[PDB]
Amino acid sequence: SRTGHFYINGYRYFTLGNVEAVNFNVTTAETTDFCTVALASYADVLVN
């Protein structure tokens, strides 16, 4: 997050002070490398 909160599998390990930009250094030989790396914003919803 922009605030710097860091979450792995839901729980938050620690929060960084701030992040201007994020760069992801992940290298996968597999052509079907991964499904998604996206941006998003807060909202109010319900869940089951």
Add this chain to the structure above:
Amino acid sequence: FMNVTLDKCTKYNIYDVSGVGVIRVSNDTFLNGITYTSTSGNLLGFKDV
């Protein structure tokens, strides 16, 4: 280090939550999170990192 007596009455501090009781191994995937608490507020089970 992670001392963990298994099957006796003990004190405990797990992730900043304290108490007393006995620990039982279980078989449940539950990879969603790291701590599980009852409606009352008393923790029921935890997963090793």
